[PDB]
Amino acid sequence: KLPPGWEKAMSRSSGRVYYFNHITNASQWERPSGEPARVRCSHLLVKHSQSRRPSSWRQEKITRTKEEALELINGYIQKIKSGEEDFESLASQFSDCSSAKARGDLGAFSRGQMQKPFEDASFALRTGEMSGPVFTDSGIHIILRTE
Ligand SMILES: O=C(O)CCC(=O)c1cccs1
Ligand SMILES: [Cl-]
Numbered sequence: 001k002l003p004p005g006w007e008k009a010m011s012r013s014s015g016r017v018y019y020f021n022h023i024t025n026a027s028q029w030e031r032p033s034g035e036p037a038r039v040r041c042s043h044l045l046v047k048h049s050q051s052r053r054p055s056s057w058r059q060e061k062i063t064r065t066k067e068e069a070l071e072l073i074n075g076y077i078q079k080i081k082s083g084e085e086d087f088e089s090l091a092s093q094f095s096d097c098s099s100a101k102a103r104g105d106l107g108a109f110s111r112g113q114m115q116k117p118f119e120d121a122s123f124a125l126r127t128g129e130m131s132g133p134v135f136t137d138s139g140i141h142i143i144l145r146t147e
Pocket of ligand 2: 064
């Protein structure tokens with residue numbers, strides 16, 4: 001049937017079927033079609049007051065709530081998916097990670113290096129695919145698999 005990680009779902013507003021990935025939190029209308037030692041990813045991080053280090057190059061003291069951080073992430077995802085904004089542009093401007101200065105690029109990595117939710121989402125993404133919101137101890141991430 002469906003590839004692992006994917007499940008069929010129903011739009012509440014339209015009744016149209018869609019597909020949801022519970023490892024990446026990605027959702028899409030089309031049926032996903034069915035692992036390497038290493039992947040390369042970029043990401044955009046939004047931190048919140050409960051982040052492991054609630055501070056970034058953008059803000060000495062990060063005070064936003066987790067719910068506020070999720071709303072910002074959701075808004076960035078909308079603009080990326082509509083093409084109004086580029087992932088790399090939003091990461092350079094608004095990512096609370098030091099990788100913002102590199103358009104969010106993390107380089108290549110193996111399993112066992114990254115926090116587990118981030119690692120699992122990165123390796124379940126197809127090349128070129130974007131995640132939905134991914135939660136870690138650092139905050140909330142949008143992940144783009146580039147290689
Ligand atoms: O933070 C850690 O414990 C390991 C590195 C890690 O997971 C990430 C750093 C940038 C994106 S996710
Ligand atoms: Cl804010």
